[PDB]
Write a protein that binds this ligand. Structure first.
Ligand SMILES: COc1ncnc(C2CC2)c1-c1ncc2[nH]cc(Cc3ccc(-c4nc(C(F)(F)F)cn4C)cc3)c2n1
Ligand SMILES: [Zn+2]
Lengths: 325, 519
């Protein structure tokens, strides 16, 4: 198969907290409506978005079945592991005006947006006839765009939403994640030819365009701009209190990395890796280890081996994921 | 590059400040106070209790905000920094502008002074500090026209404060760089980069011999630094919001501070627990000036964002959080800033609203007020004067000073072509041509310029703007090129400076008398 850019983020989403039970209790409603109309006329555009939830549920059931057998290469047993991503990708391509390899971040945002779309479509038939806040309260947060008139030192505040956090690598050499976060969220100064007109001062003054974090989701997705074969420091623990509106001690931890192999992004291969914690059911053997996904082959590797696979310049990481601790 | 023609709609003499005051200067020997109002007018008042209307004089040669002023030579000369990218030198005794250094690239924010050396320094948003001798500037005319800079460089961001010691041996600059940069004013060499604050610094101070430094930043932290040790020795936290003004006694013992939080404190540097809430003003404090009639200072003058300036006495001879003053001892009342404006559908008249909600009706063409309307509803009065005739936009209104400043840009100055009968100009023969409002106004502003007088007429032939109307030629962005009153166009020096300064798109209409044409 040649659907690595989708399969990587699918494997990442599989281990996201609340995503599993969320899509389960969301597909429950679709099955209820199917059988209720079987006992008892919607738009086809919404119907296409409805169907991918059932497709995702079948996929996740199959992945759970494959996990119970501890089969790490089902290519010789079940072709379904490759046929299901195509079943999802056809519906995805149908749901979009956009476009054998493409962006792994674009497909992530697209899947999340389609799930939010069907969440709204099911909301519009719940109170008119928690559950539908899946994507909104897992990956999407509350960004704040306060700018400060350096003369009167007054703050003007605006609110926005965000799922991904696009971030550069180098400047225009080993940069910590703090520097790369600052490059995206820190201050751009308004001063010179085009100043900022302050209504309070009624005058041209200097300003500071800064970004801030107000209310954070359960999982932070981090996009990494590049191709550049120079990686950066990837810290395990993470806290956003330095760039937060209301400084709170909600820290996060790295649990999923999507890496890119090949210089040309036109036909580069995406590889996935996910850490496993809170395995309450039984498997403490895998607790702390890292699963690596390359094509249909999943492997178990220690934390230090994966951390050395990151650091030196073969496959550079493309997406990072941090869950709340 | 692009030149705009502005003019101020005002009375000939504005006794009171139509905007807030950014700096204060006191003359001890003559009992005179200099207020640098944001309305581009430096006002001299008398500080005597015997005065009931303490107005003395006005100095109105500035264009934009006036941020800092400095007295020199026993009160003979004054130097003012302004947001019009100019530093003006005036006679303090007779209140008239002597020179205008157009050296700064951006706003001029602060001035540092040394009275033992009679030495001044100007700093602003252009990341450059310029040193000047007072006696060199006082001996300047249109003939004696020679004075360049001795600039200090290094600031990686814009400057907001400046200070020098009394002896004039050490200078310090505070920037939005969050770092105090120290230079030697004699040798012009970088001394140290004090790295203590975490926000912009807006007030600095130094002792007599230049051994210790005081700093007031927008983080609420006052800081005392030892110069020889290159370190901050003390950090006081007496304000809730930013610290914007600083004063110190003669012995360099108590610091007088204020800022965004209107509370003003006299805190002992040797023990921060010994601080007294002097008073909480009505508006955030911009600057302060101590009375030095005794080693225990008797009173302090406070200039805030409001137009009025207060004088609070310092007489403790209570205990908890009581403000030392429930009301100021002296009050210099300022005017009211025109806060809102609206242009009618005919693009001929203007409806303005000041701080007291008093609405006024103006004729931007004639450049004069029509009537005062009182505390009427602004939107209801806007909809109450509804004329259906459409006229294009041919100008812009500006309130950077608090008063009406009408600006005309080359692109759309000559866009208005109105009917003479609809314009109110009744010809005896019942004629009605088409008149360009921009051209008529340009000819009215340059009515007293003989170069426009072509054989001979004088004016546009329909109306006359007031002769006191200040006409300005300024570059778009902040640069101010020339300023003069209308009737002052008859002066030979003003005439030559106009011949050099007036742009071509004004010359071809006011002098060449040609048609404006389109685009
Ligand atoms: C999460 O995998 C996916 N999720 C969502 N979609 C997919 C497919 C792209 C549509 C996959 C996907 N991709 C490539 C794969 N190759 C083999 C499999 C089956 C398998 C996977 C994991 C395990 C396992 N789990 C633990 C632990 F620690 F969680 F208990 C330990 N081990 C060894 C056991 C078998 C497979 N599955
Ligand atoms: Zn402001």
């Amino acid at each position: 198969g040649n659907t690595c850019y989708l399969n990587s983020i699918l494997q990442v989403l599989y281990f996201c907290p609340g995503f599993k039970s969320g899509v389960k209790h969301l597909f429950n409603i679709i099955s209820r409506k199917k059988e209720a109309l079987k006992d008892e006329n919607c738009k086809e555009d919404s119907l296409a978005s409805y169907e991918l939830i059932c497709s995702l549920q079948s996929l996740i059931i199959s992945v759970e079945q494959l996990q119970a057998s501890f089969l790490l290469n089902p290519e010789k047993y079940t072709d379904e592991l490759a046929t299901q991503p195509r079943r999802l990708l056809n519906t995805l391509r149908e749901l979009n005006p956009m476009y054998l390899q493409h962006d792994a971040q674009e497909v992530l945002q697209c899947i999340l947006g389609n799930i939010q779309e069907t969440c709204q479509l099911l909301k519009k038939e719940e109170g008119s006839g928690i559950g539908f806040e899946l994507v909104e309260k897992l990956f999407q947060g509350q960004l704040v765009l306060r700018t400060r008139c350096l003369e009167c030192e007054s703050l003007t505040e605006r609110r926005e939403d965000f799922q991904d956090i696009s971030v550069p690598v180098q400047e225009d050499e080993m940069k910590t994640l703090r520097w790369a976060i600052s490059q995206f969220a820190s201050v751009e100064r308004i001063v010179g030819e085009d100043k900022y007109f302050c209504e309070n001062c009624h005058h041209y003054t200097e300003a500071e365009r800064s970004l801030l974090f107000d209310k954070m989701p359960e999982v932070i997705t981090i996009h990494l701009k590049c191709k550049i074969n120079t990686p950066l420091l990837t810290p395990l623990k993470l806290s956003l209190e330095e760039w937060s509106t209301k400084p709170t001690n909600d820290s996060y931890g790295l649990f999923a990395v999507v890496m890119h192999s090949g210089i040309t992004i036109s036909s580069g291969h995406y590889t996935a890796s996910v850490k496993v914690t809170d395995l309450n059911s039984s498997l403490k053997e895998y607790e702390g280890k890292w699963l690596l996904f390359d094509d249909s082959e999943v492997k178990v590797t220690e934390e230090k081996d994966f951390l050395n696979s990151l650091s030196p310049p073969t496959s550079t990481p493309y997406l990072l994921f941090y869950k709340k601790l | 590059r692009k030149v705009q023609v502005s003019y101020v709609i005002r009375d000939e003499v504005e006794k009171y400040n139509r905007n807030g005051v950014n700096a204060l200067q006191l003359d001890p020997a003559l009992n005179r106070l200099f207020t640098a109002g944001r309305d581009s007018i430096i006002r001299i008042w008398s500080v005597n209790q015997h005065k009931q209307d303490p107005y003395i004089a006005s100095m109105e040669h500035h264009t934009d905000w006036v941020n800092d002023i400095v007295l020199c030579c026993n009160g003979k000369t004054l130097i003012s920094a302004s947001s019009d990218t100019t530093v003006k030198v005036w006679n303090a005794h007779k209140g008239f502008c002597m020179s205008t250094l157009r050296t700064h690239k951006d706003y001029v924010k602060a001035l540092a002074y040394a009275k033992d050396k009679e030495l001044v320094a100007s700093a602003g948003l252009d990341r450059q500090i310029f040193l000047w001798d007072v006696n060199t500037l006082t001996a300047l005319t249109a003939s004696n026209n020679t004075v360049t800079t001795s600039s200090l460089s290094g600031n990686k961001d814009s400057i907001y404060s400046l200070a020098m010691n009394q002896l004039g041996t050490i200078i310090v600059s505070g920037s939005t760089e969050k770092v105090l940069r120290v230079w030697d004013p004699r040798t012009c060499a970088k001394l140290m980069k004090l790295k203590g604050h975490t926000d912009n610094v807006k007030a600095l101070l130094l002792n007599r011999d230049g051994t210790q430094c005081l700093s007031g930043s927008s983080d609420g932290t006052i800081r005392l630094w030892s110069l020889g040790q290159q370190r901050c020795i003390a950090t006081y936290r007496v304000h809730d919001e930013g610290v914007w003004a600083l004063q110190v006694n003669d012995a360099f013992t108590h610091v007088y501070s204020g800022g965004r939080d209107r509370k003003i404190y006299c805190t002992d540097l040797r023990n921060p627990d010994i601080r007294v809430l002097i008073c909480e003003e009505k508006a955030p404090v911009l600057k302060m000036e101590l009375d030095r009639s005794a080693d225990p200072p008797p009173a302090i003058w406070v200039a805030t964002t409001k137009s009025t300036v207060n004088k609070w006495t310092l007489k403790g001879i209570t205990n908890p959080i009581t403000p030392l003053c429930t009301q100021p001892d002296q009050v210099i009342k300022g005017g009211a800033s025109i806060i809102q404006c609206h242009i009618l559908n005919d693009k001929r008249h203007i409806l303005t609203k000041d701080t007291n909600n008093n609405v006024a009706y103006w004729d931007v063409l004639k450049a004069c007020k029509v009537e005062d309307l009182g505390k009427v509803d602004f939107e209801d009065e806007i909809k109450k004067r509804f004329k259906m005739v459409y006229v294009p936009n041919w100008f812009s209104v500006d309130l950077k000073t608090g008063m009406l400043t009408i600006t005309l840009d080359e692109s759309d100055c000559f866009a208005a072509w109105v009917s003479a009968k609809d314009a109110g100009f009744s010809s005896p023969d019942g004629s009605d041509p088409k008149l360009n409002l921009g051209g008529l106004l340009l000819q009215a502003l340059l009515e007293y310029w003989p170069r426009t007088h072509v054989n001979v007429q004088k004016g546009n032939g329909y109306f006359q703007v007031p002769p006191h109307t200040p006409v300005i030629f300024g570059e778009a962005g902040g640069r101010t090129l020339f300023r003069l009153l209308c009737r002052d166009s008859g002066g030979e020096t003003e005439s030559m400076l106009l011949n050099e300064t007036v742009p071509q798109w004004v010359i071809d209409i006011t002098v060449d008398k040609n048609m404006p044409k389109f685009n």
